[PDB]
Design a protein around this ligand. Structure first.
Ligand SMILES: C[C@H]1O[C@H](O[C@H]2[C@H](O)[C@@H](O)[C@@H](O[C@@H]3C(CO)=C[C@H](N[C@H]4[C@H](O)[C@@H](O)[C@@H](O[C@H]5[C@H](O)[C@@H](O)[C@@H](O[C@H]6[C@H](O)[C@@H](O)[C@H](O)O[C@@H]6C)O[C@@H]5CO)O[C@@H]4C)[C@H](O)[C@H]3O)O[C@@H]2CO)[C@H](O)[C@@H](O)[C@@H]1O
Ligand SMILES: [Ca+2]
Length: 476
């Protein structure tokens, strides 16, 4: 599917090994500290598609599918999919080629998209860099396809970052020489084939800053579908420019300020407001970035604060910001694991309750987003604009004038006092009735165009014109 098609989607990101088993168990042991395969499979994802769609997601991102190193290393099994050895075969721990195909067609039947994570930067090996046996890799069976062994000592030296090896002496990640034409040619041919064989709709590309920029334009074109890249860097002057060589990138620039604003009642709304504006002006297209606050490489939000009102607000931001929303499986169940491996918890242990607090908030936020784009073909290309901020509040506006959504977010927390915010700048007309779509109550615009928003419990408030909800099932 193209970049234009993808602007309207919302993604549920999951680790195949940790989401759902074929036997549907909700109590099978999965101690994250063991770093072993816990048993998730592609068939299990199919069985729980109602759980996922019920939150209003239109797509899923799944970790890498290729066959991995077989060993249990000192860092555990390659359950996460990032240590490949044979790119022409699939990881059998998750099922067969037919299962993968079954998945794509079960998604498509429901009007949903499939996004697959891919690695071009490196392969994986159980042992020290000097001792690698290149004959185990397929098809790159020789040391001549790879860069000479070196580890990345200085992450500020771009040359080292691209030409030296990620990993270490325990689990080493042999780095492909992506400047060689044989390497380019093989990867360009594989990526088009993988996409056509499994009917994939879009790709998440790992380790993009570790491969020279000029490789990417031809990979994105060979893939023929939207590519969103992982560039792990918080500086918009470093990451955004990658949008000149690939459709989109993950929004790490917004991640830092967003987490800092909501992880405590003293978080800064100023840093978040300024970064929204910077990304808006300085990235080639903000509407093609992926917004997130949790993933498998950082502590979960609840490891920072167990306050449920702060978790509601950060989740509302993610769905309603510019770009594509991305929630990480377990976020909706309020999971609190710390750094890898503790943030790779098995979703099934939660029992998949559809009446959890964040499951409901997410469902309501995705519901208004999905309905609005149904009615306003400009919603996805209108650039989100922060219209107000104070020490504990930020409010934003997105959507064509007359149909705009106005979202009011707070970091006061679950103890927050009850008061009335008089919000200016919303753009609605005098006397207009508005529905607050999270708690389903109504508010009326004052005669001077200001909106009297009832604040309490640190809850987020999402406003939309009552007349426009006509015929919808929202707040019915
Ligand atoms: C040492 C670890 O080794 C393995 O760790 C695994 C991991 O479990 C697996 O998931 C995969 O890991 C994946 C890989 C490798 O295929 C890459 C992508 N993620 C990578 C980035 O592609 C890379 O750039 C670097 O990312 C660096 C970044 O390049 C550097 O700039 C700084 O990032 C800065 C950023 O520059 C700055 O702006 C901001 O303020 O601070 C952050 C810390 O640190 C980051 C690491 O924390 O590491 C990330 C984990 C993926 O999302 C990630 O899941 O492989 C690694 C390496 O074997 C073990 O399993 C772990 O238990 C063990 O603790
Ligand atoms: Ca490299």
């Amino acid at each position: 599917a193209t970049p234009a098609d993808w602007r309207s989607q919302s993604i549920y990101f999951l680790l195949t090994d940790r989401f759902a088993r074929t036997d549907g168990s909700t109590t099978a042991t999965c101690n994250t500290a063991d770093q072993k395969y816990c048993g998730g499979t592609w068939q299990g994802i199919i069985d729980k598609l109602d759980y996922i769609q019920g939150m209003g997601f239109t797509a899923i991102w799944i970790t890498p599918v290729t066959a991995q190193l077989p060993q249990t290393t000192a860092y555990g099994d390659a359950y996460h999919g990032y240590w490949q050895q044979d790119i022409y075969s699939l990881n059998e721990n998750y099922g067969t080629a037919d299962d993968l195909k079954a998945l794509s067609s079960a998604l498509h039947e429901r009007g949903m998209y499939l996004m697959v994570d891919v690695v071009a930067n490196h392969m994986g090996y159980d042992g020290a860099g000097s001792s690698v046996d290149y004959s185990v890799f397929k098809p790159f069976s020789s040391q001549d396809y790879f860069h000479p062994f070196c580890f990345i000592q200085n992450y500020e030296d771009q040359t080292q970052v691209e030409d030296c090896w990620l990993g270490d002496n325990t689990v080493s990640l042999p780095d492909l020489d992506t400047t060689k034409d044989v390497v380019k040619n093989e990867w360009y041919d594989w990526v088009g084939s993988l996409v056509s064989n499994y009917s994939i709709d879009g790709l998440r590309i790992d380790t993009v800053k570790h491969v020279q920029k000029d490789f990417w334009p031809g990979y994105n074109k060979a893939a023929g579908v939207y590519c969103i890249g992982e560039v792990l860097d918080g500086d918009p002057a470093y990451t955004c420019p990658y949008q000149n060589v690939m459709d989109g990138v993950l929004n790490y620039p917004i991640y830092y300020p967003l987490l800092n604003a909501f992880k405590s009642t003293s978080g800064s709304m100023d840093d978040l407001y300024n970064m929204i504006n910077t990304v808006k002006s300085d990235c080639p297209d903000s509407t093609l970035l992926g917004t997130f606050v949790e993933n498998h490489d950082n502590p979960r939000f609840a490891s920072y604060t167990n306050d449920i009102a702060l978790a509601k607000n950060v989740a509302a931001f993610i769905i309603l910001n510019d770009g594509i929303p991305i929630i990480y499986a377990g976020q909706e169940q309020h999971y609190a694991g710390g750094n890898d491996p503790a943030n790779r918890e098995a979703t099934w242990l939660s029992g998949y309750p559809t009446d959890s607090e964040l499951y409901k908030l997410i469902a309501s936020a995705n519901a208004i987003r999905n309905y609005a784009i149904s009615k306003d073909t400009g919603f996805v290309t209108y650039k989100n604009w922060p219209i107000y901020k104070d020490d504990t509040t930020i409010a934003m506006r997105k959507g064509t004038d007359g149909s705009q959504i106005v979202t009011i977010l707070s970091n006061k927390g679950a103890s927050g006092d009850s008061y009335t915010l008089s919000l200016s700048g919303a753009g609605y007309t005098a006397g207009q009735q508005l529905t607050e779509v999270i708690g389903c109550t109504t508010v009326t615009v004052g005669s001077d165009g200001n909106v009297p928003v009832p604040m309490a419990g640190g809850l987020p408030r999402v406003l939309y014109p009552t007349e426009k909800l006509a015929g919808s099932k929202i707040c019915s």
